[PDB]
């Protein structure tokens, strides 16, 4: 997250860190949203590589003991069947991870609330991106979870020529684009939390930013629109 602020420890209890085994250690690679005690929602592109993955819930600082973490292996990966790794712009950037164990809920570990199917936010709706991604274009991961206020940019504006043009689809949510704050590498897969009817819900799964940089004016961060995939999500969890 570029231009973020440190999140309070118990603000976003559904945020997880998706990590891969690297030598004798574990490296953060993407975010995710806990949606069941044994299921996480993340981006399909995060699990393209044939790596060994684990999920950390109740995580605040990647590099220090928070005293609240639970570490759990990934038992099964279900990517959306229409996902194509060489075409992120086609959409379908979503995957569900079944955990080896069911995590315990508390003030640091909760399920993320998903929007009702078909919900589209009005232009400029209040949302926060959260994650441990790069704090600057070509920078380094954050140590502590960051948040940045990124208002939505509706489909009509987002798909206009000076924004993303044809690259953005109606199955995506755009947010931000002010040139100061944005998602960045390492934030992929995580949530876009939007306040609707007094409750935050996870409306987006972080998918991509411009190849020119993270915080680029008129290139808002692009997310998979969660409300387009409610039936798919329910179908996977029910058959697995
Ligand atoms: Cl949450
Ligand atoms: Na930690
Ligand atoms: Xe990203």
Curated annotation (Swiss-Prot):
Which InterPro entries does the record cross-reference, listed alphabetically? Peptidase_S1_Elastase_sf (IPR050850), Peptidase_S1_PA (IPR009003), Peptidase_S1_PA_chymotrypsin (IPR043504), Peptidase_S1A (IPR001314), Trypsin_dom (IPR001254), TRYPSIN_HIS (IPR018114), TRYPSIN_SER (IPR033116)
UniProt xrefs under SMART domains: Tryp_SPc (SM00020)
Origin, by domain of life?
A: Eukaryota
Keyword Membrane annotated = no
**Reactions this protein catalyses:** Hydrolysis of proteins, including elastin. Preferential cleavage: Ala-|-Xaa
The annotation note on the cofactor reads:
Binds 1 Ca(2+) ion per subunit.
Q: Name one GO biological process term.
A: proteolysis
EC number(s) per UniProt?
Answer: 3.4.21.36
Q: What is this protein called?
A: Chymotrypsin-like elastase family member 1
| Species whose genome carries this gene | Sus scrofa (Pig)
